[PDB]
C-alpha cells in the first residue's frame, strides 16, 4: 500500500484541435504521475485508445520534457513510428508501450536516457504510435530500443525511425513512409 516509485515522473497530455488555436495551444496537461499506482489511475480515469475520436491524440512524456519538437530534449531527436493495422488492439498496444516506458524495462540505463515519451494518434487513414527519442544518431542505442518496442508490442510490420527534421518537413496527406533506420 506504500506507493511504488517510478524511475521517472511522467506527464499525460490530450491533444484536441479547435479552430483558432495554434498547434501547441491544442495540448493540455491532464496529469502528472510518479508511482505505479498513479500511472494506472491516470489510464483508468482517461479515455481508452479504442474509444477516442479521430485526430484527438495522447502524449506521455517525462515531466520536464514538453510534448513538442521545440523542447531541447526533442529538437535534435527522432521517433520510432508504428503503423497500426486493422487486426491490432490499440488498447493493448498503448498499455504495453506505456508499461515498457514507465517501468523502464530496457536492458541498459543509456536506453532509458534516450526516452522522451510516447504518442498515440488515432486516424481514419491508419492510426499511429510513436516513441520519441532524444537523439537521431545514437545508432546502436536507437536500434536496441526499436527492437525492444517490437518485442513488447508483438509487432510484425516494419517500424520507422524518423528524425525531427523529417517529421517537420513531412507534408500532411503524403503516403510516403520511410525512416533513417528501419526494423
Amino acid at each position: 500500500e506504500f506507493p511504488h516509485p517510478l524511475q521517472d515522473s511522467w506527464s499525460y497530455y490530450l491533444f484536441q484541435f479547435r479552430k483558432a488555436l495554434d498547434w501547441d495551444e491544442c495540448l493540455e496537461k491532464v496529469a502528472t504521475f510518479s508511482t505505479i499506482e498513479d500511472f494506472w489511475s491516470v489510464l483508468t480515469h482517461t479515455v481508452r485508445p479504442r474509444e477516442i475520436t479521430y485526430g484527438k491524440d495522447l502524449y506521455m512524456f517525462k515531466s520536464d520534457i514538453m510534448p513538442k519538437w521545440e523542447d531541447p530534449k526533442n529538437e535534435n531527436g527522432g521517433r520510432w513510428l508504428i503503423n497500426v493495422t486493422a487486426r491490432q488492439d490499440v488498447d493493448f498496444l498503448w498499455d504495453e508501450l506505456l508499461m515498457l516506458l514507465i517501468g523502464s524495462d530496457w536492458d541498459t540505463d543509456e536506453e532509458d536516457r534516450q526516452i522522451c515519451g510516447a504518442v498515440f494518434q488515432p486516424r481514419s487513414r491508419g492510426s499511429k504510435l510513436s516513441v520519441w527519442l532524444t537523439s537521431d544518431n545514437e545508432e546502436e542505442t536507437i536500434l536496441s530500443i526499436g527492437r525492444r518496442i517490437k518485442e513488447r508490442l508483438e509487432l510484425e510490420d516494419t517500424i520507422y525511425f524518423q528524425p525531427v527534421s523529417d517529421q517537420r518537413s513531412q507534408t500532411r496527406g503524403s503516403d510516403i513512409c520511410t525512416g533513417k533506420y528501419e526494423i
Binding site: 516509485p5 505505479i36 514507465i102 517501468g103 523502464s104 524495462d105 540505463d109
Partner: peptide, 15 residues
C-alpha cells in the same frame, strides 16, 4: 539506480 518493473509486476499492481 535505475528503477525497473516488468509487465508481470505492473499488471499485478493493476488487477
Amino acid at each position: 539506480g535505475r528503477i525497473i518493473y516488468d509487465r508481470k509486476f505492473l499488471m499485478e499492481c493493476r488487477n
